[PDB]
Design a protein around this nucleic acid. Structure first.
Ligand code: SF4
Ligand SMILES: [Ca+2]
Length: 345
DNA sequence: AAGACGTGGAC
DNA sequence: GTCCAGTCT
């Protein structure tokens, strides 16, 4: 019942779509950026980051020419930082290889870093009108209910099935609007919990509603604890010691206060050791937890004084207090410094 | 295939 | 506490 369906949806959308920052226009650059920021992040959280990110990087060219340090800083606190590392690379590519023009061909655009099945569809359909599916979490929840599909949405296979379902019901006339409508619906009406089926504009076509199982869909499956000792080294009144994390793995390329994964009870010994401009640490300042998707950091901050006996090399870099605000730190280490400041005062 | 990969704001 | 809001390997 395509046409019938892809009509009440596009209508509801027309009068119900939220005026979000990235919806001011259909510029591929703006769209691409927002589609990447919204991955595993709520709109409310993203809005401020988007305004800021665009003010700072108005065009793809600006983003491409932008240094990498500045880019991570604009993403500071958003999470899954590899998203911006990939976007920065993909953009640098679009300008050097495609003349600052975003490829409008699924195959071409899909080769860029960070661009997956969903992003290919989202950007190209919303910006260029390419009839490709834009299946994300919200969409799978909506489609699993409309068509009462019980396959584990976690399986790529399931996603593929859903992508097939979209190709057979999308308004090939206006794919872009059709793809957003489906997403808004999942964001505003067909919510994870307590879906507002009574107010939904496509209840007529929903099998899950007819069966009374809407709240049970979609179907999906269901971490490692890690002790971390952190050292805040301060100079004879001034600079503190920090280092740029490895470019691969956890919190890649972000700055942090020197630390070590004790994986046990090493403690101040572990940190005092890693030093090898030596130094010694005092008693802890505070211990707290910080969660990631796949692990939890049980942090322990250790105060300390630095004594210069050599140059600051390797990953390390000496930094004056008033300059820490220039470096991008994970939320975890932003608290390490917060706690530290409310300690010495 | 399924673990890696941040962070926060409803329930 | 729990449940989300995609891509790479
Ligand atoms: S009827 Fe209810 S379950 Fe079906 S799509 Fe609308 S909100 Fe989702
Ligand atoms: Ca791809």
């Amino acid at each position: 019942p395509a046409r019938e369906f892809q009509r009440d949806l596009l209508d509801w959308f027309a009068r119900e779509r939220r005026d979000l920052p990235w919806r001011k226009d259909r510029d591929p650059y703006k769209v691409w950026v927002s589609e990447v920021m919204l991955q595993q992040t709520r709109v409310e959280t993203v809005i401020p980051y988007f305004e800021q990110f665009i003010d700072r990087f108005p065009t793809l060219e600006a983003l491409a020419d932008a240094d990498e340090d500045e880019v991570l800083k604009a993403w500071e606190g958003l999470g899954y930082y590899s998203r911006v590392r990939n976007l920065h690379a993909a953009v640098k590519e679009v300008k050097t290889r495609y003349g600052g023009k975003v490829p409008d061909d699924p195959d071409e655009f899909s080769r860029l870093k960070g661009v997956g099945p969903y992003t290919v569809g989202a950007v190209l359909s919303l910006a260029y009108g390419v009839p490709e599916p834009a299946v994300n979490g919200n969409v799978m929840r909506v489609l699993s209910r409309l068509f009462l599909v019980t396959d584990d949405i976690a399986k790529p296979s399931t996603r593929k099935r859903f992508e097939q379902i979209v190709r057979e019901i999308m308004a090939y006339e206006n794919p872009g609007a059709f793809n957003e409508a489906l997403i808004e619906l999942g964001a505003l009406v067909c919510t994870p919990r307590r879906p507002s089926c009574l107010l939904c504009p496509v209840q007529a076509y929903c099998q899950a509603f007819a069966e009374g199982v809407a709240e049970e869909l979609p179907v999906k499956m269901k971490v490692k604890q890690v002790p971390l000792a952190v050292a805040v080294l301060a100079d004879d009144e001034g600079r503190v010691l920090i280092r740029k994390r490895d470019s691969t793995g956890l919190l890649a390329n972000l700055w942090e206060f020197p630390s070590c994964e004790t994986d046990g009870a090493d403690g101040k010994e572990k940190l005092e050791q890693m030093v090898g401009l030596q130094v010694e640490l005092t008693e802890p300042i505070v211990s707290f937890e910080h969660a990631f998707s796949h692990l939890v950091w049980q942090l322990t901050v250790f105060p300390g004084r630095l004594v210069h006996g050599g140059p600051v090399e390797e990953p390390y870099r000496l930094a004056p207090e008033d300059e820490l605000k220039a470096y991008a730190f994970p939320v975890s280490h932003q608290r390490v410094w917060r706690e530290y400041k409310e300690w010495a005062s």
